[model samples]
Target: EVLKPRTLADLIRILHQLFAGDEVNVEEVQAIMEAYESDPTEWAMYAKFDQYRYTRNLVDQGNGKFNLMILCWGEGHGSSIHDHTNSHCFLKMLQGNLKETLFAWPDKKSNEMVKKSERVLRENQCAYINDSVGLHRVENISHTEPAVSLHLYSPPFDTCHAFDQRTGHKNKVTMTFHSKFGIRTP
Candidate 1:
């Protein structure tokens, strides 16, 4: 009962339909993501890993509307505590195990982040988050196996902020792609 698009282009079309509105419902997107399947054969090239997590762009609509990517994580690798700016994001786990920890800021001026909740996602599981609420950290929980996940973002972001939990420092960072449409980047 894996209900997903047959091809990458199909998925992109479906996403466009899902997000073609002024207000995108997070719960609706989460339900669609949970129902969608990540077929390895369609995303094999993008499912590559390095020492750190790597991202390959699958679809870049170029209108600042939406984009799709595949993020591959090596053993014990994870992302920094971060927020997506004003974008909405949906993540679907394709392979292996991943742990997502959510955090909250105590005060606007405070540099401390409080642990909110955590969840582990396996194959076919999905989650969604928006920029306004909580920040999150994603990790490959397995030491022996790598992990792969599909991410879709609306109003695709070129830059975002990563927070340092210890010092409460925030840095703006640009996103990079490991590959684009089967072409690898160096």
Candidate 2:
């Protein structure tokens, strides 16, 4: 119990330590993310859902370089197709399920969006992506239940481009946190 994380708070602390550096080993972090399972009670406080759009709550801001966050998705709510600002993103499901759709980089000239693939991730499952892997749109995919997912982002970014599906236009948007350190922002 000394070094092993036993609660959501402990995991956040451990993640803070691991992500403080300029670089994180992708495989090592992937294995750690895949092995750890968080109880719903441990993270419920930070998962305040909004009916209008998905909520993103900050859990840990890793040394101003990376960020750990919990995203709460309302039933049927989802993100617009967007890029990650060339940062590394790792997502782990904590509750319910989410369907992720992957799309290729925007062809601004022709305004094209090529969907590469899609999958539904359930509790205890995880995935990774970056600009290299292309853009993505994630949703709860359930009409009756909400979903929660943990995210680790390297080189914390505040701005990214959200693409229009039909027009293929990259609209820049600023990211915001619904809460910070477990407290909802007014």
Candidate 3:
């Protein structure tokens, strides 16, 4: 039997190849995700569900060229309206469902984040965005079911701005991972 199932490790390996170039083709990356089946058993380790908040678990660092993460959202948990700096963030839903809210860039002087549009993402759906695409907030709308998403960031970055839409206040925040390489952070 020559049939071999694609695994998380395989995905990472292919991503390294795709990101090797100066520019990563969004279509190719997204196509890979679209074809990837949900692997609860293979990814069970990083599916670390936090009761109070979402968790970010790193899968690959991509030789500093890009990063891969699994984000698990607890029931009703969501993100602060955030900017990605100069990176490309492609998110693909892997489990349950999530609601993504997009906002226009904050006004230069006013710092107001004008709400643009919103959509609920089902499993296997993908979204691609960058700082120029403006800020966004992602959430698990279900009070009972948790949500999980796979994310790829090209040209990895550390710090980004998190915003308060109502107050028009934006604060720089450092991104952190709950686990790396299947090892939990202490």
Candidate 2 weakest lDDT stretch, 10 residues: 1-10
State, as a TM-score between 0 and 1, how close model 1 is to the true structure: 0.87
- What TM-score number comes out for model 2? 0.92
Task: State the weakest 10-residue window (summed lDDT) of model 1.
Answer: 54-63
Candidate 2, position 124, lDDT: 77
Q: Write the per-residue lDDT of candidate 1 for residues 128-152, one digit (tens) a residue.
A: 8776668889998888888888888
Residue pairs with colliding backbones in model 2 are none
lDDT of 3 by residue, 1-186 (tens): 322228777777888888888878887787786567778898888888787989999988999889989999998999999999888899988898889899987665665568888999877877888988878999998988899999999888879999888766789998888989889895
Ranking by TM-score: 3, 2, 1
Residue 55, candidate 1: alpha-carbon lDDT: 59
TM-score of each: 0.87, 0.92, 0.92
Cα TM-score of candidate 3: 0.92
Candidate 1 residue 120 Cα shift, in angstroms, is 0.6
Compute the lDDT of residue 77 as modeled in candidate 2: 88
- Candidate 1: segments with Cα more than 4 A from true spot: 1-8, 60-63, 106-112
Candidate 3: deviation at residue 26, Å? 1.1
Cα lDDT of candidate 3 equals 0.84
Q: Name the 10 consecutive residues with the lowest summed lDDT in model 3.
A: 1-10
True-structure lDDT of candidate 1: 0.77
